[PDB]
Symmetry: C4
Subunit: 332 residues, 4 copies
């Protein structure tokens, strides 16, 4: 594999069509799914030259701990759909690569099993109808050693997945929600923040004033995201709001972004627009589908090489230097 696109081709070959569609699809007309890629392709970096690259490092510190790359594995539900080892294969490879892994509320292996793999597990929360049950799930994650609560805030309900409707897609009997819903509000965020000392990261923020309110609410971070184009069809790409959100946040929390990251150059673009780190979703599942744990390892090694390559070519010895790069929008 010499690009993440190689892995997409390999996963399309192996997966059943309706499972590939569950993974690849977005909501509605897929306008936001496509725009996530359009937006990154319009960004060009202005690289710097002639800087010291003696000790180029892609490492970052986030939520108190070192990560090997400015990247984490996005929460993607039901990973046993893609490979029999599911979440355990992905979490093992992430651990070995030094990348945080976000455990899903709708994981097909229990959160305690996945946390026992080790590494840096985060936990993605969906709000349950029942504050008490929601908080018990947060407490389970904390007791199991997860380091952050990634509270998904853009799913009052699931978007309209027209591929799934047309395919009549349903979970196989052999895939279940191994950890076993209502719209979340700012009151739900406060209940979580009061229940845990872990950093609470709000995933799915796109409006500048919601990013400011997230800091005011005590969030340790946000993920600027349109949920990979799977929720509101026509939601702006996170990448297009990132710069304005980073300016409004004034360092008050970590600002991550996701949606459409398909290379180390895309990581560099996100960093140059001000992201602390990115999440990567579909490509990790492609690698899982194509070759299990070893596939995910290869993907993360390829992404690490691409990130190091892009940083050094752009004159950046550290991720902080990359955040100080300027960019210019082009036409594609």
């Amino acid at each position: 594999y010499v690009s993440l696109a190689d892995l997409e081709r390999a996963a399309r070959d192996v997966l059943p069509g309706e499972i590939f569609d569950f993974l690849a699809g977005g909501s509605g007309t897929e306008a936001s799914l496509v725009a996530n890629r359009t937006a990154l392709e319009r960004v060009f970096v202005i690289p710097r030259m002639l800087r010291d690259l003696t000790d180029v490092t892609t490492e970052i510190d986030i939520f108190g701990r070192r990560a090997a790359l400015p990247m984490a594995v996005a929460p993607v539900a039901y990973q046993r759909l893609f490979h029999p080892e599911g979440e355990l294969a992905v979490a093992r490879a992430a651990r070995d690569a030094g990348v945080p892994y976000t455990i899903c509320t709708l994981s097909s292996v229990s959160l305690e099993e996945i946390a026992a793999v080790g590494g840096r597990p985060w936990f993605q929360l969906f709000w349950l109808r029942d504050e008490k049950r929601s908080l018990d799930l947060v407490r389970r994650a904390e007791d199991a050693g997860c380091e952050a609560i990634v509270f998904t805030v853009d799913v009052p309900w699931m978007g309209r997945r027209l591929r799934d409707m047309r395919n009549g897609f349903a979970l196989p009997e052999w895939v279940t929600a191994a950890n076993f819903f209502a719209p979340a509000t700012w009151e739900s965020v406060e209940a979580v923040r009061a229940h845990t000392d872990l950093p609470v990261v709000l995933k799915g923020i796109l409006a500048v004033e919601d990013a400011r309110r997230a800091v005011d609410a005590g969030a340790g971070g946000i993920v600027v995201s349109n949920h990979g184009g799977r929720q509101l069809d026509g939601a702006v790409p996170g990448i297009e709001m990132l710069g304005e959100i980073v300016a409004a946040v004034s360092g008050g929390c970590e600002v991550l972004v996701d949606g459409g990251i398909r290379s180390g150059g895309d990581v560099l673009k996100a960093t140059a627009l001000g992201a602390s780190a990115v999440l990567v979703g579909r490509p990790v599942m492609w690698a899982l589908a194509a070759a299990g744990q070893d596939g995910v390892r290869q993907l993360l090694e390829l992404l690490a090489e691409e990130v190091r390559d892009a940083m050094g070519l752009a004159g950046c010895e550290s991720v902080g230097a990359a955040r100080r790069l300027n960019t210019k929008l082009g036409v594609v």
Copy 2:
């Protein structure tokens, strides 16, 4: 049907080619027909998160009465071209869905028959050569219980419909103007406004100063519209003028928009740009062609679900909240 595009495919299958072309076509090179869709596809919404969605409602009040959605059926002439029940099938489904139905001056069933279906009938006026006859038509509509006069102001004459010319299209002998023309001016508007206590809504306004003059003239509303691309070829899309017109009108009348609405997300976009409500034309006829009254019912149920979905995903419990959403233009 899981999208309005499903219905377009179904109507193309059933209708004779020249009737599909009469419905689908625009004037000239169809630049404005295409631009109506281009414009909506360039708009992206910035959704809000974590708001109370306990009681999401798509209802609005307009011209004194409640409507179930921020939408009405646009005036489309000669609906018996598309289905034997024509206007009665559409008006029955609109009534049952809680959506106003605009009766045409060139309806193929008389306006009194269509008004007798019930619901919320509006009446679309074309100016007749003869003030007295024009006003008698307004009086008929009022006597029959129509709630608003939608005065079409962008047809001094019909545009150049090159599909119709190339097809040699003419009305079948079995379709007639069952209610049975000169360019309208501001004097014509004043004559209508003085003749009726119903709100007069000027349909086909695109210039900001014409929107201001409409308020000064006593209009209760305007429809920002290029007539679905069927009149001036190269007229700007209504959606591209809507924000500037809403700012200039300062709440002085209702501001509707039409042209290219093909989903509940498109309704959300129009609302976010400031529209009070939208009109929907061609998709309603697709549903009529495909399956008569039941087809139109299914279309309106699908649109209601899409509007509720898009509003809630965007953090909006009411249409007023949706009007306060911000937007960002993209590239497609």
Copy 3:
């Protein structure tokens, strides 16, 4: 024929490929040829409604005389390439339509023969190496009753016509320059202006300061033009400079535009951007090729209908009103 594009198809059928290429082609990569069309397609008009259209007229006054439309036939050399009657067929149809006809320096029928057709003949000048010969040609045109001298200023030499080079195209022995070259300068303009009381119109101006200098030099008009994409490849379209040039000229001369006019709507766009009138080149030759004099008559009747249609749909009873229309750029 219901559009000018119908005539293009008819002319491609009848003409020999290398003559169609001589007519259709531009210089170099044809970037400016394509951009002339791209530019018009990006312009959208903001029409006005509810204005008095009792007496819509497409007439203009230019260089002291009435024309039936805001249009003249552009200078196109060697019209016998396209039809045996060549320039006489075109000039007869232009006369009958009330449209000025620009006689070429490189006409395949003598300028005195073409002027004898009547109508409103203008004369397009190329500067000869020899001031005295150039001025004698101007004097011939004046003696023959031409009403304006259209001095082409964008041909210090012919551009690189790669279609012609690849085709090995040369004039047939039966086509000659029936009136029988050096780069023109501002001194050449002054020599012409001093030699004739006819208005001198500089054709091929694109820079704002050249338009200002043209007024200072005593020009009666300019044609904002990149020579139909046939001279500098990569020259900006005239339509993209027109508004800035009209503002800089402050009414000091007539400002015409050409390049890519393919409909009455395009005429309206040019007028709305501030042009006094347009020139039309290739479409007139298409009509000549397809059907001789009668073809050109049909073209001009079609253009007259399209111009009247577009003006009235846009609320304009006169060309002056059309010049006061606003426009908005779109994406196509």
Copy 4:
């Protein structure tokens, strides 16, 4: 050959696929390779008319000596890949055309042999791990009569050439680095500047502040360049930074540009955006592949004719006049 694109077709016919790919390819997704062409195609020139063209000249003075065109042959490694005479064929043709030739550090014929051809040889430096060896290479070039040191500053290492990886491309045994690496820094630039009285030209500058620092560092020139899209994938095109860099440099050094020059019109565009001169890479190798020395001669004669044509059509008797042209961005 009537365009540079003719030569590209001829070279694709003759070269082995993997050598054509080595020549044509870029890094990563080739976003910057494509954008180099997109950027030039978006630029339109505003030509001037009616200026004296008695003595049009394409000559420039650069680094103290006259060149026949505002162009030099870019450094392209291993030219024996394309033709058995390699660098000697290209340098002979460049000499005969009056164009400087940049000798590569990775030339397949020794720099002393190529300099002995005569003409105006420049020398492109890659920094060696070893200041002393780097400076000895600079001294060899100077001793052999090279006139400028073109220090490539955008290669801390080679970019990711996915065509080469997929092809398994390697140098044939019969091609070697006949002159026989570490990241360069500003200290490396100072070591070169102190070692030679030749002008030092930094190639691969894209950031405005790096251009300013280059002047402060004593560079005699810079090449605004993304290395033909072969280094950072997603680096901005040089052409898009050129105007801002020329303004920041305030005449303090020569400002060249490269990437995607495919015609004399493209040379004119670069000049109008403020470049002192351009470099041309791939087209020179196409000509070498297609027909050896004579091919390169034909290419340079064609480019000279296109540059003279474009300059005169744009009203420019000198390259300095062309630099004073204005431009307008379009859509393509």
